[PDB]
Design a protein around this ligand. Sequence first.
Ligand SMILES: *[C@@H]1O[C@H](CO)[C@@H](O[C@H]2O[C@H](CO)[C@@H](O[C@H]3O[C@H](CO)[C@@H](O[C@H]4O[C@H](CO)[C@@H](O[C@H]5O[C@H](CO)[C@@H](O[C@H]6O[C@H](CO)[C@@H](O[C@H]7O[C@H](CO)[C@@H](O)[C@H](O)[C@H]7O)[C@H](O)[C@H]6O)[C@H](O)[C@H]5O)[C@H](O)[C@H]4O)[C@H](O)[C@H]3O)[C@H](O)[C@H]2O)[C@H](O)[C@H]1O
Ligand SMILES: *[C@@H]1O[C@H](CO)[C@@H](O[C@H]2O[C@H](CO)[C@@H](O[C@H]3O[C@H](CO)[C@@H](O[C@H]4O[C@H](CO)[C@@H](O[C@H]5O[C@H](CO)[C@@H](O[C@H]6O[C@H](CO)[C@@H](O[C@H]7O[C@H](CO)[C@@H](O)[C@H](O)[C@H]7O)[C@H](O)[C@H]6O)[C@H](O)[C@H]5O)[C@H](O)[C@H]4O)[C@H](O)[C@H]3O)[C@H](O)[C@H]2O)[C@H](O)[C@H]1O
Ligand SMILES: OC[C@H]1O[C@H](O[C@H]2[C@H](O)[C@@H](O)[C@@H](O[C@H]3[C@H](O)[C@@H](O)[C@@H](O)O[C@@H]3CO)O[C@@H]2CO)[C@H](O)[C@@H](O)[C@@H]1O
Ligand SMILES: OC[C@H]1O[C@H](O[C@H]2[C@H](O)[C@@H](O)[C@@H](O[C@H]3[C@H](O)[C@@H](O)[C@@H](O)O[C@@H]3CO)O[C@@H]2CO)[C@H](O)[C@@H](O)[C@@H]1O
Ligand SMILES: OC[C@H]1O[C@H](O[C@H]2[C@H](O)[C@@H](O)[C@@H](O[C@H]3[C@H](O)[C@@H](O)[C@@H](O)O[C@@H]3CO)O[C@@H]2CO)[C@H](O)[C@@H](O)[C@@H]1O
Ligand SMILES: OC[C@H]1O[C@H](O)[C@H](O)[C@@H](O)[C@@H]1O
Lengths: 801, 792
Amino acid sequence: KLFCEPSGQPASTAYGPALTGRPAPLGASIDADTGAINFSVFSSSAESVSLVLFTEADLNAGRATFEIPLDPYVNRTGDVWHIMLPDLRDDLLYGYRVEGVHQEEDKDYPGMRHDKRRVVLDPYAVAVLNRRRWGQMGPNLPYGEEGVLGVMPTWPQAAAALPAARGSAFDWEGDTPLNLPMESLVIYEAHVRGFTAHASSGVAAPGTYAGMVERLDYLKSLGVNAIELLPVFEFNELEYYSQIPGSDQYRFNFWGYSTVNYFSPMGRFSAAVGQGAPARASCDEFKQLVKECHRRGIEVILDVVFNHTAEGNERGPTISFRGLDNRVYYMLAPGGEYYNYSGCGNTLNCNQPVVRQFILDCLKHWVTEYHVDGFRFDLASILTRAHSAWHPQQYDQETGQRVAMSSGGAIVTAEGIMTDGAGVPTGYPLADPPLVESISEDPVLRNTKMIAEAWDCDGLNQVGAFPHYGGRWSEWNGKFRDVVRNFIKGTDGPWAGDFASAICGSPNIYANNTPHETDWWANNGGRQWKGGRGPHASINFVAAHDGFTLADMVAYNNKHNEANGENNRDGEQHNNSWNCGEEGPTTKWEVNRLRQRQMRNLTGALLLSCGVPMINMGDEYGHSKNGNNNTYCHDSELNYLRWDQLAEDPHGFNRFVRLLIHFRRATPALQRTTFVNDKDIQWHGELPNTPDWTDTSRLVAFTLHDGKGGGLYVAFNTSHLPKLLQLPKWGGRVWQPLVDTSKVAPYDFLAVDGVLSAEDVAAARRQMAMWTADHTYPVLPWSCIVLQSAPEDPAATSMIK
Amino acid sequence: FCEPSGQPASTAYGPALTGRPAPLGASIDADTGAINFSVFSSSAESVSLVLFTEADLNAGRATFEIPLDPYVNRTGDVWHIMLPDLRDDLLYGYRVEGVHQEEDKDYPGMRHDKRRVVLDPYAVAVLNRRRWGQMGPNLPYGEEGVLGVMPTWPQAAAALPAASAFDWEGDTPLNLPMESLVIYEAHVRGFTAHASSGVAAPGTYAGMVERLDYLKSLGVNAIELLPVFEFNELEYYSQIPGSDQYRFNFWGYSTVNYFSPMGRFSAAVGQGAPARASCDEFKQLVKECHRRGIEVILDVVFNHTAEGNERGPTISFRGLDNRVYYMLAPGGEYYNYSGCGNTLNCNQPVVRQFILDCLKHWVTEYHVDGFRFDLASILTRAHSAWHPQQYDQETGQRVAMSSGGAIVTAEGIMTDGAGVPTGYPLADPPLVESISEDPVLRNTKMIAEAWDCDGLNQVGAFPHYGGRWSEWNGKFRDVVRNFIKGTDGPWAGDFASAICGSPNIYANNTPHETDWWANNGGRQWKGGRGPHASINFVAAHDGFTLADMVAYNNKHNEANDGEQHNNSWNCGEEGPTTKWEVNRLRQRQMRNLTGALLLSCGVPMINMGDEYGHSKNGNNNTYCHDSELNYLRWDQLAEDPHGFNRFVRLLIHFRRATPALQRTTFVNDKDIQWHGELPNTPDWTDTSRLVAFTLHDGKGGGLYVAFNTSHLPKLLQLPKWGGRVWQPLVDTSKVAPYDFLAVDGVLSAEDVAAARRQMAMWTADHTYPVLPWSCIVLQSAPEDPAATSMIK
Ligand SMILES: *[C@@H]1O[C@H](CO)[C@@H](O[C@H]2O[C@H](CO)[C@@H](O[C@H]3O[C@H](CO)[C@@H](O[C@H]4O[C@H](CO)[C@@H](O[C@H]5O[C@H](CO)[C@@H](O[C@H]6O[C@H](CO)[C@@H](O[C@H]7O[C@H](CO)[C@@H](O)[C@H](O)[C@H]7O)[C@H](O)[C@H]6O)[C@H](O)[C@H]5O)[C@H](O)[C@H]4O)[C@H](O)[C@H]3O)[C@H](O)[C@H]2O)[C@H](O)[C@H]1O
Ligand SMILES: *[C@@H]1O[C@H](CO)[C@@H](O[C@H]2O[C@H](CO)[C@@H](O[C@H]3O[C@H](CO)[C@@H](O[C@H]4O[C@H](CO)[C@@H](O[C@H]5O[C@H](CO)[C@@H](O[C@H]6O[C@H](CO)[C@@H](O[C@H]7O[C@H](CO)[C@@H](O)[C@H](O)[C@H]7O)[C@H](O)[C@H]6O)[C@H](O)[C@H]5O)[C@H](O)[C@H]4O)[C@H](O)[C@H]3O)[C@H](O)[C@H]2O)[C@H](O)[C@H]1O
Ligand SMILES: OC[C@H]1O[C@H](O[C@H]2[C@H](O)[C@@H](O)[C@@H](O[C@H]3[C@H](O)[C@@H](O)[C@@H](O)O[C@@H]3CO)O[C@@H]2CO)[C@H](O)[C@@H](O)[C@@H]1O
Ligand SMILES: OC[C@H]1O[C@H](O[C@H]2[C@H](O)[C@@H](O)[C@@H](O[C@H]3[C@H](O)[C@@H](O)[C@@H](O)O[C@@H]3CO)O[C@@H]2CO)[C@H](O)[C@@H](O)[C@@H]1O
Ligand SMILES: OC[C@H]1O[C@H](O[C@H]2[C@H](O)[C@@H](O)[C@@H](O[C@H]3[C@H](O)[C@@H](O)[C@@H](O)O[C@@H]3CO)O[C@@H]2CO)[C@H](O)[C@@H](O)[C@@H]1O
Ligand SMILES: OC[C@H]1O[C@H](O)[C@H](O)[C@@H](O)[C@@H]1O
């Protein structure tokens, strides 16, 4: 009955005799009055659970240091196994050896995959230790043979770190989440390793959290106020380890979309872990990073991958969920086959109530413990899909043994199709997925920003209609990307009209609510989610870590992923790109000229649109992956911030981008929570108020008011020919040049900085005064301008100085 | 030895000697040191030499009078006397007695009056009134013994030769190749009269010297002076109803004496110095021009004199030999091809020789470099001849002759003695021939204003004697003015020709169907000349200012005549305005006209003031105004409110630095090519508003030039020259100083490089945007792909 009562297992050279303990909280926690360590882990299906303890030396030799088997009657309440250890030695790490049935051993129990030869990881582990250093192979052991822990050299035994002692807690120094209004954000999408891994970073600890801190100043000076980190939860970079043919380079799991543990920071991004620090060092190093971001005005948004795990399918390794309770954690068919909506091996059983709670807890854990500001949910559609349910295992009354069940205990239709227990066939996209409801409504998370990549690998696309619970979710707007890429490169079809919509924050998606005639989601489950949102629901992007780099969108018609080892079958097939006249690096002046313009024209579309822009690390200076549009597996300069190329800025593109960011941020009209109307914005062409929406259009142009008598004139000429634009006349006022991608840098962006003085800017405005007074502006093919309304001053046409 | 001629000595000289007829004028006998006086009159009966102290001259009174013996003191029609040991501070004239036609109708054309004392045509210096605008004395003119005509025309006298020659310090005329000239038409008083000039002696030869560095810095290498031969600025002295101000003869197109420099442009004469002081003041001016590589070209007026018609004053020729010196009908009426009252008898032999002697004088004595011939057509016309006077061998008295001795046809029409009707324009005028062939003048430039007031126009075919003559090209003016304002018609085509040095006017051997001169007297002159035959101008002292032809549709001459068809456009409003679009457009058009002028083959001339936007407030004939209308506004030049003076200055230097525009032969199709919005696709239609051309430098480089005269802007596809890109230099659509991208005190070489780079994407695309009513000049340069990287 009582938690303090000893449970029978004897003391050791490193702990007191075990006590009963408690179900809550899940994970390992410090008991407050005794100082002891309570362990709690869920499994509905395990027959036995042992807590396994390791020193690092023993961990590395594939052996346990101590084992404590839990009594199934004492050390268990419902489905939560638990035990407590006083005087536990700090140099020890922990896991669980879970015994039960496996389907390959007995057909009658499909979905069960217990294996006592493995020691599995606590899902709620605060920190994980296995391999200390990025890219370091696991130790050479006789894996597979009796008594040795670990799957293979690329998957050695891992273990969880004990909770920190009372009195030892992080000095936040009064740090808090920043809660910046969403519409005010400029998101930079970044990878922790790649941010400083290149020799040119010059940081003390390349490719780490601490390293990232040394170069955070550059981001603040760039004008960014949010950073979105690619997956930061423990993953195994050696999981795709193999040789690249034609090379001695080896491929890795670099990006990290394959999560081993969701509660622990990636240890092989921690400088301290590389230097031999205890496993929790990653925790405090990550905290430090978040503190440093916040000091600099930068929010932290974590890319989280709750739709599949590193365990893959049946052929993958057993490291956590599979060996604890495979039927609970993964989405399974009645035979035990893994659903593969992720396209990565398995699908997490998101709406199953234990799993739901896991995810809730996880998000609260990162917000509360690490002061994070938001999450970006990889393939978020899978979080809408209905789970697989199994009946609770029924045991024999007299015998105590295990009783087999109709359909293995899978809850099915009369036709055998799998079900969520509540009458919904497994996989069905729910209009009201209870996981998403809980995320949207949990008080701990109420000021936390949520962003959905609203699609998955089974062709489900929910953009415009992700279950958003009152405007509580924004979305990666891939239609924006497609529209901007198409319109800017110069293309027939609806792209001018669509581009104008993109510029306005895509009201055609988020405000409008009449669905496509053949779109099943929008006509059914998504129906109620279709309006009731603003332009800030749209995360706008032209490029991401996925797909072509900005520079490569203008240098490559086609992808070149041969080095990825899926023989070019991977990555986006339709990039809507144009090489500007020749594939890859060229010597032709005409083509390079054009690319310099196109890069800026695309950036202009991005930073001059309503909604919320996101920039892919590197795109702000011309970064190239040599035409590889899916560099998930390369630990090389293809995925690193080129501090050397940034400094060089050979055509002044970084200056242009920086300055446009700052300008965007100084322009309230661009940062809205409600959609612009005809008083806010007007559309033009070669003549004022005469836009071209035809299929052959190559021009979109508009005025944007500032509600103080001023505003901007913006134009995108996507023709192969130059044009003379007649500008709308605002009485008493004249348009003044600011942006012009026709001009060689620095005259492509007329604002004061280290390169152009106030005098230089005024001189450059006066030069054109005859043109602007005339309300006439010449534009180059494939070019972009931004002008500002100023009070007319007839003295502008007299001699300058 | 010259025999004594019998006249007594006096306090001022010794017993007179006979003297010689040569040289004409007053001169020093090399043998005795005596002053020899010589003077032509075939018609006179008596001639007395009259001498004046300055005091006596001022009081209308002669100090001495020496009657000449008609036998001993005369050889042929030349009267002469020598006076030894003459007080050199006296001045001289002649009292000439003879018949007058009003006192006797039998002698039409004779206008002797012995109450007058007339000036030596060959006078080296004249004294009459010492200061500009100074009224003559208030004498009882017309009464017995009082000399002078009225207060505006008091008695003049001529100075004697000096017995201390000027120090030229090796000065010679510069003999610059004609094709290298940029000419500045200027007026000696107007140049420094304005308070802002800040000179010691405003409005004088000495004052002009003090500001010549301005002209050198401007890049001008020839100055053409409005008439510096003595004239009477009080000829038109009269009050202007509007104002306090009086009307003058300001410009000076009404000469009193052709051999004397205008005394009232001399600071020294105005200060009481002897009359000769102006000779040295003028020599100093020429010397100082030459030190600065500036040539001196004199505007000369040999087609008429200040004596007007029969209602004007007898001061010189009329009283000496009216019949010789003036073009007369058989009743003694004054032909008036000049539109001024008289016509000088240019091709009669004594007259011819006078003009020639005059030109030689100014070249030899004053080191002048060239002449501009006012209404030069008049010098091509046949003169009027009269039989030599007949006297009774018995009585000695005059004999009347048939027709008054006029040499007429059977129908009574006047003739030149050799069968040509008086006034007929000659293919081979001996005066123009002599000018063209005389060795003294062989390296002297000659410029004809080849028309006159009876509608004779000879441009394209002035008798030029192997290209010895250039001409004011009035076609250029009209064409450039019409093309640049935007005007339907043949203007684009004519403008292209104007740019080529007007070969349609000077090398075109095919004359018009109707033009008499070209089909007859001028036929032999219709070719054999290069573009340097054409003196190009957009404006001159006559007509509208550059500024004003862009600000006024119609003239405004109330305060006074003046051109009626000006081909101007005010750019949207008459005169001054606050409308911004008008002022902007005027600023461009000033540059656009000046560009047409300075980017054309031939020889450009700039009218004083037009390099800073000088205005005459819409008055297009300011001949009678001694005021800031005709003064160089040093204050306004200093202000340069929209950088127009800078623009002009640079354009002039750039032109001098461009051999391709300074030619003695005409451009062919290898030299120049004609483009439009597309390369090699010009528009010659009646609605054309664009002319553009490439001009080779002979080294693989060259210029792209274009004038958009449309009201709409254009995009221009430039012609692609392999391995090369066009760089911006001139763009009249850019606000100064970016209208002219050249290094000076305002733009660094850094500034220029950066201005060029800005546009590297436009030029590499071979695409150039131009504003309406604008003009650009680009410069072919080797292609540098790195131009489009960061300027840095
Ligand atoms: C938003 O969303 C997406 C997705 O989240 C992001 O997309 C990017 O990231 C993706 C994931 O990184 C990436 O996809 C690529 O990887 C996945 C796998 O994660 C691939 O998925 C398919 O193919 C794999 C591999 O064929 C299948 O895996 C199954 O089979 C293998 C067995 O072949 C199992 O591997 C396991 O066992 C092997 C063998 O024992 C282990 O390898 C070991 O031995 C080898 C030699 O024999 C050695 O080479 C190796 O070093 C040893 O370790 C291995 O470690 C172990 O995992 C799997 O477990 C099993 O599931 C999948 O079933 C199948 O779906 C894709 O094809 C790849 O493209 C995307 O391209 C990225 O774009 C996106 O970025 C986000 O925005
Ligand atoms: C090249 O080509 C041309 C021409 O060379 C240049 O053109 C410019 O210069 C022109 C010449 O300066 C200028 O023309 C203007 O002036 C001329 C004359 O020089 C005019 O010619 C016509 O009209 C006049 C005036 O009616 C005629 O004059 C004749 O009659 C008058 C009147 O009697 C005579 O005047 C003489 O008599 C009176 C007697 O009392 C004297 O006046 C005095 O009393 C006045 C009051 O009662 C006082 O006010 C006055 O101050 C007193 O002195 C007068 O002084 C005296 O001379 C004339 O002698 C007699 O011939 C002409 O015959 C007739 O042809 C033009 O009409 C004028 O426009 C042009 O406008 C310029 O553009 C050009 O610049 C070059 O490219
Ligand atoms: O140069 C003359 C030509 O220019 C214009 O066509 C260009 C397009 O604007 C430009 O986007 C690109 O088109 C490519 C598509 O974007 C790409 O998806 C793929 O299909 O290849 C196309 C080119 O190979 O390039 C073309 C021209 O190269 C203009 O639209 C034409 O009308 C014009 O004749
Ligand atoms: O005026 C404010 C208005 O701006 C935006 O509307 C523009 C659209 O984005 C744009 O596509 C275009 O719409 C036209 C279609 O493209 C065309 O095919 C045809 O059907 O006509 C449509 C209407 O013109 O132009 C509109 C502006 O007229 C924004 O989307 C609006 O919500 C906003 O109110
Ligand atoms: O290219 C060398 C050539 O240039 C100049 O000739 C141009 C003329 O100046 C210009 O008027 C124009 O002539 C055209 C007429 O206006 C038109 O009405 C019709 O008759 O055709 C004419 C041309 O075909 O163009 C010519 C250039 O062709 C200049 O006159 C010469 O010095 C030189 O030979
Ligand atoms: O399912 C995968 C795909 O879904 C969506 O249709 C997106 O447009 C695409 O970018 C994404 O990768």
